[PDB]
Design a protein around this ligand. Structure first.
Ligand SMILES: [Cl-]
Ligand SMILES: [Cl-]
Ligand SMILES: [Cl-]
Ligand SMILES: [Cl-]
Ligand SMILES: [Cl-]
Ligand SMILES: [Cl-]
Ligand SMILES: [Cl-]
Ligand SMILES: [Cl-]
Ligand SMILES: [Cl-]
Ligand SMILES: [K+]
Ligand SMILES: [Mg+2]
Ligand SMILES: [Mg+2]
Ligand SMILES: [Mg+2]
Ligand SMILES: [Mg+2]
Ligand SMILES: [Mg+2]
Ligand SMILES: [Mg+2]
Ligand SMILES: [Mg+2]
Ligand SMILES: [Mg+2]
Ligand SMILES: [Mg+2]
Ligand SMILES: [Mg+2]
Ligand SMILES: [Mg+2]
Ligand SMILES: [Mg+2]
Ligand SMILES: [Mg+2]
Ligand SMILES: [Mg+2]
Ligand SMILES: [Mg+2]
Ligand SMILES: [Mg+2]
Ligand SMILES: [Mg+2]
Ligand SMILES: [Mg+2]
Ligand SMILES: [Mg+2]
Ligand SMILES: [Mg+2]
Ligand SMILES: [Mg+2]
Ligand SMILES: [Mg+2]
Ligand SMILES: [Mg+2]
Ligand SMILES: [Mg+2]
Ligand code: NA
Ligand code: NA
Ligand code: NA
Ligand code: NA
Ligand code: NA
Ligand code: NA
Ligand code: NA
Ligand code: NA
Ligand code: NA
Ligand code: NA
Ligand code: NA
Ligand code: NA
Ligand code: NA
Ligand code: NA
Ligand code: NA
Ligand code: NA
Ligand code: NA
Ligand code: NA
Ligand code: NA
Ligand code: NA
Ligand code: NA
Ligand code: NA
Lengths: 337, 174, 132, 144, 165
RNA sequence: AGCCACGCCACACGGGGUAAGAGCUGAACGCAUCUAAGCUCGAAACCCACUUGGAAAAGAGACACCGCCGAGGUCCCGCGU
RNA sequence: UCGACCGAGUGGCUUGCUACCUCGAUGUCGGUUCCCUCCAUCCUGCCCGUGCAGAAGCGGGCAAGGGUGAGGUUGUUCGCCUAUUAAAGGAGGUCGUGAGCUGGGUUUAGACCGUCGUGAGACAGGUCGGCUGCUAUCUACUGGGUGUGUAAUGGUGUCUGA
RNA sequence: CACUGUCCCAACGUUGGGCCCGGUGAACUGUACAUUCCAGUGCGGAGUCUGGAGACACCCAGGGGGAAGCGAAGACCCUAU
RNA sequence: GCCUGUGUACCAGGAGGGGAACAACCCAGAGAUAGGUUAAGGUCCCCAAGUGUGGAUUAAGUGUAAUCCUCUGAAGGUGGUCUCGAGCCCUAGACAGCCGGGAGGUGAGCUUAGAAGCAGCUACCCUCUAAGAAAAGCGUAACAGCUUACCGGCCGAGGUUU
C-alpha cells in the first residue's frame, strides 16, 4: 500500500535562498597538526578541459597506466594578506580583539575598503601578546584579498576580501609566522599553501537559476500519464494532509534556486602551474585565455566562469595524499565544436 | 554508627575533603568516598567512617567504604596481584605489552591485533604463557586483568568449541 | 562483484528483448530481473553490460522456450566509458546463457564480447571468438 | 552580554537550587529590584540525572515551523526558568524580566550573596546535577 | 472463550430460578469432593483454605480450571491415592446471559452459562492434610488463585503451630 | 553556444555519553552478588565532528579603518558571474 | 522451540453497538502525488539464549537513523502469483491528501439477463453506457522586496554564534 | 506484429499568456475581531475559551494545507393524517 | 458521553466565588452603593496569603490529579525501603565464612560378569569416638574424585524462621 521512497531533495542545504555574500565564507578550518601556515587560498574559475594522467593509486589494478581525468581550470594568482586579526576567548565564544595592518597597499584596494592612513600596529601587536600571556587568545586569522586586475578575463578590478585562518605550530610561533607574512605587504601564492596531489575543499556560490519550480529545485516527479494532460504538469499533488492544517516548510515548493554557498569536500589538486599550458583553443567560452598562475582541480567546482572560489586543505580527507601526479597530456582542444 | 580502621605500620593516610589518600612502600592510592551524611576522617593512627544515619542504605555504603580502605591498606604494602594464563588450540596467540597497552596478535588467526589500555599504575608482566597483573589500586588492577580476558571474548561462535583466550587464574584475597 | 573497469549506462530494462549469442538453441531472451539489483519507487529495474540477469526464452527451440534461466550481458547499444575516456557501443544487445557456476550453457559464442566481461566471467571470456 | 549591568542585587547560584532561586529572583524583580544571577553553570537541580536530562532533551527536541526555542547553555536555561515565574507578556512582567540577567561565572568585582533556603549541602546529597553538566549533555559548547 | 470482564461483577439481580429459565448449559466442574472421600475432615491435623478477597462471580469453567490445576498438583505430589481431601465449597447457581443472536432491540440475553457468587472473605477451597504435606496444598492453592479473577489469601485454619514452627 | 542527464565530480573517520548486554571493585547479608554508593566497556540510535541558514539574539553583538562638510550611499550611463 | 485450559490487561488499525455532532450538504471507494509521524522491528547496527561445531538457522533484548523496490489477474482495499532483494514490516495523520489529479467500482436518469411480482416495478444479484464548478479576503508555508528598531555621529569592509 | 515520451525520467526548444509599464475596468464574498502554532477544553471536528510556545510593520510572486473555504433551505434517509 | 424507571436536588430559566478552560462538582442563591469578616478553595513564583511549626515516610519527579467520557492502570510479582508483632537458637560462643577431621567391620547383603554411599531389591546393624549416613548430591564402564550430613578449631554478637 503506497511503496515508500525517500523525500524529494535534502533538508540540509536550507533555506534555499540567495547567498548574502558572493564571496563564500568557510564554516570550518583544518586542524593544527602541522607547522604554522595560512589555511586557505582563492582564485577565479575559468573553465574545464581534460587531462591524461598516470594512475598513482597503489590499490588500483590500473596503477601506472594512463587515465583521462576531467579538470576545472582556476586562475590562482598570488593574494595579499593585508592584516592579522586576533580572537579573544570569552564566555560568549570567540570575538575579534584587534588587528595588525600593513602600511603597503595594492592600488585598487580602495575600491572596497577605506584604507588605513593612520594605524598603530605595534599597539595592536602588544594587545595581542598581552592576551596570549593571559591565555585569552583564541584564534589567529589573516585578512586577505585577491588581485582580479591580475586576471584580465575577469572584468572586475575591485578585490574580493576574505578572512582566512592561520593554523599550525604553537600559538607563539603561529603569531610570529602571521606577523612576518603581513609586514611584507602580505604577498603569498598557491604554491605556499598547497602542493599538487593534495586534497582541498573548494567553496563557492553556485550558478544562479533564479526562480524555479519543485521539479527542478527539489527533484519531484512531473505529473504522469493522463494526469499530465489535465491542466497540471509541473505541480505537486498536495501541500499536505488535512491536519496539521498548515503547510510544512518541508514540502517542496518553488523559490530561488542556485546562487547558494556550497563547500565541496576532497577535491584533488592535479597541478599548480603558471602560463598558458591549460588554456583552450579559441579561448575558454564566455571567459577568455589563461596565461598566468593556475590550479587544475579534479572534476567540477561550484559556480559559473569568473566566480571567485576558495580553497582550504581538506578537513576530512578519505585518502592519503599522493603527491605530484604525472601529467602525460593536457587537452587544449577548442571547447567550441 | 561508627567504624574505626587502625592504619597499619609504615602506612600513611591523608584525607582532603571527600578524598582519602593512602601511601605505602608499594605506592599511593587516592579515592573519592562520597555518600550522604557519611563522614570519613583520619584521626591519628585510625581512619574513621561514621554517620548519624542507621538505615539499610547507609550501612551498605559504610561497609563498602570500610572494605575500600582496607583494600587500599593492602595495596600500598603487600600489593594486589592477578594471575593469568593464555590458552590457544590452533593459532598461536602472541601477547605482549607495548607502551601503556597490552596487545594480542593472531587471535583465532586474525590479521588485526586486539588491544586494551592498562589502567593507572598497574603492571603487566608476561612470562611465556603466564601473565601477572599487579599494582597498589585494586580497582585499576582488577579492571586491567578483566579487560585482558574480555578482549578475547567471542559472541558469534560456540565458546565450548572455541576456547582460545587469556584467562584470570589466581585472584587476590584480603 | 569485481569492478568492470568501465562505467556503464544500463541500456536494458526488465521486459527488454535481446539476442542470445550462443549455440544453446535459445534465440531471443526476455529480461526478467537483474542480479544484486534494487531500484526505487516507479523505477524500471535496469540491466547492462556485465550484469548477470535472470531471463526468459521467448524465441528458439521448443525445449528452450518458456524456460527461466540466468545469463550475462555481453553487448549493448548504449555506450560505456573506458578509463581513457573513449566510449564503446555495440550493434545489438546480447546476452549469453549461463549456469549456476557462470559457465556458458552452450559450447560456442556468436559475435564479439566486451573486454570488461572477462574481468567478471572467465568461462564466458574463454569461449569467446572475438573480444573487443 | 558584556554590557555592565547595574544590579541592586547580585545572587550567587553556586550550589543552589535553581527553582528556589528563580522563584525569589522573580518576586524581587517584580518588586522593582534589578538582579544579576551569577555562576549559573554551578547552579544545581536535585533528583535523578537521567530523568532530568530526558526532560531537558525533550524540550530541545520539540518544535516546528512556529518554533519552540529552548536554550542549551546554563545562562539561557536559568533565564527561561525565571521567565516561567513572570507574567512576561504583560508590561510589568516584561519590565521585571528585563531587569534580570544571568551570567556564566562572575563578571562582577564583588562576590554575590546566597539567598536563604536555596543552598544545597553536598555532604547530604548525591542525587542532583549542575546546570553546566546538563548543557554539556545537551551539546552546548563549554565556555565556562 | 468470552472474557470474564463480561461476567465477573455482581451488578445484576440474582438469576437462579430454573422453573423460569430453560436451556441452562451443564457445569464443567467434575467433582466438589477430592482425595479421600471416605475419611472425615476432622481426622487431619492441618486445615488450609483459599479465601476470596473481593466479592465476585466466578464462572463454572474458571472454577474447573482452578480446581483442576490445584488437584492435579496434589495428585502429582501426594499421589493419586494420597492422604488428604480437598473441598470446592461453592456451586455455580447464577445463570448468565449474552445478547448475541438486532442490536439493543429485544436485548434480553440468551442463556450462555453459570457462575458462583462469592462474597469477599469466604472460603472457596478448603483442603485437609497431614503436617508434612501442608506446603503442597499451599502450592496447589497458589496455582488455583491464578485461574480465578480475585486476589486471594491462603489461610491455615487448623494446626498452624505444628507447621514449620 | 547555452541549458541539460542518459554524462562527470564530491558526500567520514574519530571522539564523548548511553540502551540492551559483557564485566570490575563492592556492601547491605563476615560468604556470595555487574548495583545499592563507585567504576571499565558497549548500538546504524543521542551529543560533538561536517554542510546550510543565522545581528530583530530587545543582553538587538565584536574588530579595524574612514568620516561628521563631508566618509559613504542613492540616481544616472555601459553592462551581466 | 511449540504451547492448551483458565485468569488479568493494553491498543483504537476491523467489525458490531449507541444516536452525542452536521441534513439552509464537512464531496464517495480504490488509486495517485507530496509531507509528517507511531513501534507491537521486515532488513540494517549492537546484543542474549539455543535442541549454538562450522555454515545456514530458530527464538529473544535494545533500537524508529536509513531502507522496505519492480511486475501478471482484479475498480478493487485485501489477497493470489512471478522474478529479483539485505529486507521487499505493519499502522496514524477527516479510513492524511477531488478550492491537487483520476473516475475503473458503489449509487441518478437509457438498456439487457436471471429471480420475484397479476402489474407498475423490485433485487443487493450480474451486465454495457452514463458530467468532476470557483479570478484566494484571511490564515499557512516557499522564495523575493520596502521600512522601522538596535542608534543625541554616520559609513566601508571583515567577523562572532544564541 | 508494428509503433511510439503512456512509462523508466525527464530535458531543450516554439507560439500565446503569465511578470513590469500606459489606458480601460467588473464580479464572487464580507456578524465582529483576527500575526499564529502546539496541546487541552468545549454540543464529542476552536485563529477568538484555557495553558504554554512563537510573533517588529508593510509590500511582491507562488503553489493551494486550513478558515469542517465559496457556490446550492441535502438529491440519500426518515417524518408530514 | 447507552436505552428505560424511580426518589431527590440542580441545569434548563441560576448570577457571583472556587475548579486551568467547562450547563448541572464544591461555596453560594443576587436591589444600588460603601466598610468589614468569612465560605469553598488556597498561602514557592506566575497569584492575594507561609519558602509556617512539631514529627515521620518516599528517590519513583512516585507525587504535586476530590468528583470526571475527562484524573487509568490489573491479575501477578518485589532481600527497594520503613514500622509493629510471634517462635526458636546464642558469650557453656550462635548464623556465615575459613582451616582441620568426615574413621573401622565394609567393597553391608541380595542382584550382577563386576553393583565398591550413590542401576535395582531388602535391610539399615556394629565398633572406635569430639564426631562421621549400610550415604543427602554431583561423578565413574565399574573403582577414582568432589562435596552434604556430622565433630573440632579460628573469629566474636547477634542469628534464624514466620
Ligand atoms: Cl501524477
Ligand atoms: Cl580524500
Ligand atoms: Cl525485478
Ligand atoms: Cl523549533
Ligand atoms: Cl504574561
Ligand atoms: Cl541523595
Ligand atoms: Cl491513477
Ligand atoms: Cl433563590
Ligand atoms: Cl521533573
Ligand atoms: K448531513
Ligand atoms: Mg480532466
Ligand atoms: Mg563545447
Ligand atoms: Mg568533439
Ligand atoms: Mg553460526
Ligand atoms: Mg508505480
Ligand atoms: Mg471542505
Ligand atoms: Mg520495542
Ligand atoms: Mg524517522
Ligand atoms: Mg480519507
Ligand atoms: Mg496514507
Ligand atoms: Mg483538499
Ligand atoms: Mg473538485
Ligand atoms: Mg479551483
Ligand atoms: Mg465510473
Ligand atoms: Mg465498467
Ligand atoms: Mg459501469
Ligand atoms: Mg473533548
Ligand atoms: Mg494564548
Ligand atoms: Mg433542507
Ligand atoms: Mg427517494
Ligand atoms: Mg429552555
Ligand atoms: Mg504574593
Ligand atoms: Mg507522573
Ligand atoms: Mg478516582
Ligand atoms: Na484544467
Ligand atoms: Na490540458
Ligand atoms: Na479535503
Ligand atoms: Na528538582
Ligand atoms: Na526546541
Ligand atoms: Na428487528
Ligand atoms: Na487472581
Ligand atoms: Na563511542
Ligand atoms: Na543589530
Ligand atoms: Na467503532
Ligand atoms: Na450546515
Ligand atoms: Na481516494
Ligand atoms: Na528504523
Ligand atoms: Na497485484
Ligand atoms: Na472528511
Ligand atoms: Na478520490
Ligand atoms: Na473533482
Ligand atoms: Na513530447
Ligand atoms: Na488553501
Ligand atoms: Na433552581
Ligand atoms: Na471558573
Ligand atoms: Na512528574
Amino acid at each position: 500500500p503506497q511503496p515508500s521512497r525517500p523525500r524529494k531533495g535534502s533538508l540540509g542545504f536550507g533555506p534555499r535562498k540567495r547567498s548574502t555574500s558572493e564571496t563564500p565564507r568557510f564554516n570550518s578550518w583544518p586542524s593544527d597538526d602541522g607547522q604554522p601556515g595560512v589555511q586557505g587560498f582563492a582564485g577565479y574559475k575559468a573553465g574545464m578541459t581534460h587531462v591524461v594522467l598516470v594512475n598513482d593509486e597503489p590499490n588500483s589494478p590500473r596503477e601506472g597506466m594512463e587515465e583521462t581525468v576531467p579538470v576545472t581550470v582556476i586562475e590562482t594568482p598570488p593574494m595579499r594578506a593585508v592584516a592579522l586579526r586576533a580572537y579573544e576567548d570569552t564566555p560568549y565564544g570567540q570575538r575579534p580583539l584587534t588587528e595588525v595592518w600593513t602600511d603597503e597597499f595594492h592600488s585598487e584596494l580602495d575600491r572596497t575598503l577605506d584604507v588605513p592612513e593612520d594605524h598603530d600596529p605595534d599597539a595592536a601587536e602588544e594587545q595581542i601578546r598581552d592576551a596570549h600571556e593571559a591565555g585569552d587568545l583564541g584564534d589567529l586569522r589573516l585578512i586577505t584579498h585577491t588581485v582580479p586586475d591580475a586576471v584580465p578575463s575577469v572584468p572586475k578590478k575591485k578585490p574580493d576580501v576574505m578572512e582566512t585562518r592561520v593554523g599550525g605550530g604553537s600559538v607563539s610561533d603561529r603569531l610570529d609566522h602571521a606577523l612576518d607574512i603581513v609586514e611584507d605587504g602580505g604577498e603569498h601564492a598557491m604554491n605556499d599553501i598547497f602542493r599538487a596531489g593534495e586534497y582541498a575543499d573548494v567553496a563557492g556560490v553556485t550558478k544562479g537559476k533564479g526562480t524555479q519550480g519543485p521539479v527542478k529545485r527539489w527533484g519531484v516527479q512531473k505529473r504522469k500519464g493522463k494526469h499530465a494532460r489535465q491542466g497540471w504538469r509541473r505541480r505537486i499533488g498536495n501541500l499536505g494532509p488535512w491536519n496539521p492544517s498548515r503547510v510544512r516548510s518541508t514540502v517542496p515548493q518553488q523559490g530561488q534556486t542556485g546562487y547558494h554557498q556550497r563547500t565541496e569536500l576532497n577535491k584533488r589538486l592535479i597541478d599548480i602551474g603558471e602560463g598558458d599550458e591549460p588554456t583552450v583553443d579559441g579561448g575558454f567560452v564566455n571567459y577568455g585565455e589563461v596565461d598566468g598562475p593556475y590550479t587544475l582541480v579534479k572534476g567540477s567546482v561550484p559556480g559559473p566562469d569568473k566566480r571567485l572560489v576558495r580553497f582550504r586543505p581538506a578537513v576530512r580527507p578519505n585518502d592519503q595524499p599522493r603527491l605530484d601526479p604525472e601529467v602525460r597530456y593536457v587537452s587544449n582542444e577548442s571547447n567550441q565544436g | 554508627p561508627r567504624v574505626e580502621l587502625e592504619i597499619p605500620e609504615d602506612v600513611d593516610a591523608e584525607q582532603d575533603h571527600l578524598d582519602i589518600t593512602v601511601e605505602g612502600d608499594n605506592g599511593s592510592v587516592t579515592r573519592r568516598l562520597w555518600y550522604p551524611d557519611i563522614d570519613v576522617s583520619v584521626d591519628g593512627d585510625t581512619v574513621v567512617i561514621e554517620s548519624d544515619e542507621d538505615n539499610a542504605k547507609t550501612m551498605s555504603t559504610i561497609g563498602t567504604f570500610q572494605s575500600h580502605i582496607e583494600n587500599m591498606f593492602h595495596g600500598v604494602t603487600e600489593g594486589w596481584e592477578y594471575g593469568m594464563e593464555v590458552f590457544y588450540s590452533h593459532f598461536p596467540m602472541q601477547v605482549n605489552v607495548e607502551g601503556d597497552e597490552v596487545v594480542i596478535e593472531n587471535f583465532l588467526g586474525e590479521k588485526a591485533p586486539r588491544r586494551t589500555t592498562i589502567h593507572g599504575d598497574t603492571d603487566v608482566e608476561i612470562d611465556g604463557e603466564e601473565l601477572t597483573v599487579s599494582g597498589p589500586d585494586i580497582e585499576a588492577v582488577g579492571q586491567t586483568a578483566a579487560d585482558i580476558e574480555q578482549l578475547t571474548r567471542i559472541n558469534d561462535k560456540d565458546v565450548r568449541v572455541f576456547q582460545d583466550g587469556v584467562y584470570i587464574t589466581r585472584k587476590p584475597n584480603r | 562483484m569485481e569492478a568492470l573497469g568501465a562505467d556503464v549506462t544500463q541500456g536494458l530494462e526488465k521486459g527488454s528483448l535481446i539476442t542470445c549469442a550462443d549455440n544453446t538453441g535459445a534465440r531471443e531472451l526476455k529480461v526478467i530481473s537483474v542480479h544484486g539489483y534494487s531500484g526505487t519507487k516507479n523505477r524500471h529495474p535496469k540491466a547492462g553490460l556485465g550484469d548477470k540477469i535472470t531471463v526468459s526464452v521467448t524465441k528458439g527451440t521448443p525445449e528452450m522456450r518458456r524456460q527461466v534461466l540466468e545469463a550475462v550481458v555481453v553487448r549493448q547499444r548504449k555506450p560505456i566509458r573506458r578509463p581513457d575516456g573513449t566510449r564503446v557501443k555495440f550493434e545489438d544487445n546480447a546476452a549469453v546463457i549461463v549456469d549456476e557456476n557462470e559457465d556458458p550453457r552452450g559450447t560456442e559464442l556468436k559475435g564479439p564480447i566486451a573486454r570488461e566481461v572477462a574481468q567478471r566471467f572467465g568461462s564466458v571470456a574463454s569461449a569467446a571468438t572475438m573480444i573487443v | 552580554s558584556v554590557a555592565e549591568f547595574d544590579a541592586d542585587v547580585i545572587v550567587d547560584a553556586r550550589d543552589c537550587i535553581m527553582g528556589r532561586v528563580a522563584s525569589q529572583v522573580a518576586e524581587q524583580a517584580l518588586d522593582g529590584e534589578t538582579v544579576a544571577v551569577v555562576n549559573a553553570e554551578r547552579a544545581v537541580i536535585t533528583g535523578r540525572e537521567e530523568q532530568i536530562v530526558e526532560k531537558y532533551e525533550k524540550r530541545v527536541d520539540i518544535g516546528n515551523d512556529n518554533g519552540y526555542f529552548y536554550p542549551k547553555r546554563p545562562d539561557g536555561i536559568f533565564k527561561r526558568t525565571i521567565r516561567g515565574m513572570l507574567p512576561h507578556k504583560k508590561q510589568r512582567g516584561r519590565e521585571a524580566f528585563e531587569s534580570v540577567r544571568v551570567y556564566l561565572g562572575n563578571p562582577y568585582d564583588e562576590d554575590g550573596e546566597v539567598l536563604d533556603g536555596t543552598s544545597l549541602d553536598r555532604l547530604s546529597n548525591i542525587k542532583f546535577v549542575t546546570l553546566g553538566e546538563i548543557s554539556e549533555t545537551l551539546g552546548a559548547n563549554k565556555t565556562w | 472463550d468470552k472474557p470474564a470482564s463480561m461476567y465477573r461483577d455482581i451488578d445484576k439481580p440474582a438469576y437462579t430460578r430454573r422453573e423460569y429459565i430453560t436451556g441452562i448449559p451443564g457445569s464443567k466442574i467434575a467433582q466438589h469432593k477430592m482425595g479421600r472421600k471416605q475419611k472425615d475432615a476432622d481426622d487431619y491435623p492441618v486445615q488450609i483454605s483459599l479465601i476470596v478477597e473481593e466479592t465476585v462471580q466466578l464462572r463454572h469453567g474458571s472454577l474447573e480450571a482452578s480446581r483442576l490445576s490445584a488437584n492435579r498438583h496434589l495428585i502429582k505430589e501426594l499421589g493419586e491415592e494420597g492422604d488428604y481431601k480437598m473441598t470446592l465449597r461453592k456451586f455455580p447457581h447464577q445463570v448468565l446471559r449474552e445478547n448475541k443472536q438486532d442490536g439493543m432491540r429485544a436485548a434480553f440475553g440468551k442463556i450462555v452459562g453459570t457462575a458462583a457468587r462469592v462474597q469477599a472473605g469466604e472460603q472457596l477451597f478448603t483442603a485437609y492434610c497431614n503436617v508434612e504435606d501442608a506446603e503442597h496444598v499451599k502450592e496447589a492453592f497458589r496455582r488455583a488463585y491464578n485461574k480465578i479473577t480475585p486476589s486471594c489469601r491462603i489461610k491455615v485454619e487448623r494446626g498452624e503451630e505444628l507447621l514449620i514452627a
